[PDB]
Design a binder for this molecule. Structure first.
Ligand SMILES: c1ccc(NCc2c[nH]cn2)cc1
Length: 330
């Protein structure tokens, strides 16, 4: 089997991407944030605290003939940005882009943090990291990809995120029309539950390439690119008037700037992030200070190849017995 679904930016800055997901019988379609950095499929629901729902579409398990309470199971998750959600668990039929999994754990939110409530466009998350991170207790549950894997033509999914434009998530096949050149594969560590890999270095603009190992995760559910402070300082030093602002919480730059590109290494290959991808717009409406898309990972404890990096590539999440990542230009 295969599946193919379009993923759409939630706003003009590509803060995140939403992908329609069919849950239950008859189908209830919710727009979920596909997150290769987490392993819970959770949704706004008929159980969510009413004051914490503001425009999201909800899953109502009592309207699904295939929904079953997973008796005793609860979940609770915290994300790297301080946001959180928690609740109970149903099993139900979940389809993505024509690919169906029966008996998928659908984690129903009783509580969500203010950032989730305040984002009307995201109805929940679909985790695509390794199932070892799933938070369901006392019986840990599998991701949608882990449940689908054995049925798929090939045990892979691909992320093809757009710049200010829709893109695609494919499951079970590699669309050889969606990228240029060849796919370079690189080793993954699953020891922390993430798609963790080692970049071979970076360049700023037309600068020389610096060969240096950068351990980090491929995380579709993080907006920005978070790298070591040395690398980030080297990037922003090429932008007149850029600075790290403790008040704003990262590097800002004059909105009048033209940003340089950023290149990262994948083995002997190179992925170039155009400068425009690094512009996250005014810090507040009407400001001439703009927020940077490359930020320090200092204090986060891991480097994160978030959407800013991944949207520059066609990315293969290879879930073979020894997982690997693939990157191609596009
Ligand atoms: C700042 C924000 C995001 C992340 N991951 C975000 C996230 C939110 N929900 C799922 N992943 C890490 C640092």
């Amino acid at each position: 089997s295969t599946g193919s679904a379009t993923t759409t930016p939630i706003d003009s800055l590509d803060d995140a991407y939403i992908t329609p997901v069919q849950i239950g019988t008859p189908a209830q379609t919710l727009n979920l944030d596909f997150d290769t950095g987490s392993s819970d499929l959770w949704v706004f629901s008929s159980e969510t605290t009413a004051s914490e729902v503001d425009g999201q579409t909800i899953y109502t398990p009592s309207k699904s003939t295939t929904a079953k309470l997973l008796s005793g199971a609860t979940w609770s998750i915290s994300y790297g940005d301080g946001s959180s959600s928690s609740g109970d668990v149903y099993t139900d039929t979940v389809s993505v882009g024509g690919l169906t999994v029966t008996g998928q754990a659908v984690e129903s939110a009783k509580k969500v943090s203010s950032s989730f409530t305040e984002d009307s466009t995201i109805d929940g998350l679909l985790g695509l990291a390794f199932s070892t991170l799933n938070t369901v207790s006392p019986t840990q549950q599998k991701t949608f990809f882990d449940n689908a894997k054995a049925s798929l033509d090939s045990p892979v999914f691909t992320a093809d995120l757009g710049y200010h434009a829709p893109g695609t998530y494919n499951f079970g096949f590699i669309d050889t029309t969606a990228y240029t050149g060849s796919i370079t594969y690189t080793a993954v560590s699953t020891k922390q539950g993430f798609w963790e890999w080692t970049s071979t270095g970076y360049a700023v603009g037309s600068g020389t390439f610096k060969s240096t190992s950068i351990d980090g995760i491929a995380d579709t559910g993080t907006t920005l690119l978070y790298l070591p402070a040395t690398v980030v300082s080297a990037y922003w030093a090429q932008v007149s008037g850029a600075k790290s602002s403790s008040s704003v919480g990262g590097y800002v730059f004059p909105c009048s700037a033209t940003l340089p590109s950023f290149t990262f290494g994948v083995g002997s290959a190179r992925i170039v992030i155009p400068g425009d991808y690094i512009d996250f717009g005014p810090i507040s409406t009407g400001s001439s200070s703009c927020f940077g898309g490359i930020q320090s990972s200092a204090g986060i404890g891991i480097n994160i190849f978030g959407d800013v990096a991944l949207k520059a590539a066609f990315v293969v999440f290879n879930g073979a017995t020894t997982p690997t990542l693939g990157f191609a230009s596009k």
